[PDB]
Amino acid sequence: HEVEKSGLLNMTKIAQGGRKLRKNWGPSWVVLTGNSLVFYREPPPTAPSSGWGPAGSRPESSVDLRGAALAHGRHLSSRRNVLHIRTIPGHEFLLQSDHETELRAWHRALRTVIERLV
Ligand SMILES: O=P(O)(O)O[C@H]1[C@H](O)[C@@H](O)[C@H](OP(=O)(O)O)[C@@H](OP(=O)(O)O)[C@H]1O
């Protein structure tokens, strides 16, 4: 169960179990594994390229990527580089970076992960 990609992104929840939510954008240390996206309030104390950081570091949340859906976040945010993710329990969120190459890489990595879970 380990790390395909990790990085800081801006994130907001859009819906939880299909209930719409008021956006609340903010920075998150994001960790993509082969089956999940895990969100941390902040990045590791050190060795951030390792993804998880210390084992005692607790995540705020994570989602199951099996059968998740990806889409451009244009209709849900005015932020330039925005990706919308919807997972099968009906959680929806936006990921966003000020750097399009960063967000582009996340888009491609996330897709590949969902695809390997079919
Ligand atoms: O003004 P505060 O309470 O901080 O919250 C806003 C954010 O600051 C904006 O970034 C949101 O718009 P974008 O998602 O288009 O960036 C904006 O989204 P909205 O204008 O589409 O509702 C709000 O979520």
Swiss-Prot record:
Transmembrane regions listed in the UniProt entry: none
Lineage: superkingdom: Eukaryota
Assembly and oligomerization: Interacts with FASLG.
Task performed by this protein: GTPase activator for the Rho-type GTPases by converting them to an inactive GDP-bound state. Has a substantial GAP activity toward CDC42 and RAC1 and less toward RHOA. Has a role in regulating adhesion of hematopoietic cells to the extracellular matrix. Binds phosphoinositides, and has the highest affinity for phosphatidylinositol 3,4,5-trisphosphate, followed by phosphatidylinositol 3,4-bisphosphate and phosphatidylinositol 4,5-bisphosphate.
The species this protein was found in: Homo sapiens (Human)
Domain PH: 2-115
Name of protein: Rho GTPase-activating protein 9
Expression across tissues: Predominantly expressed in peripheral blood leukocytes, spleen, and thymus.
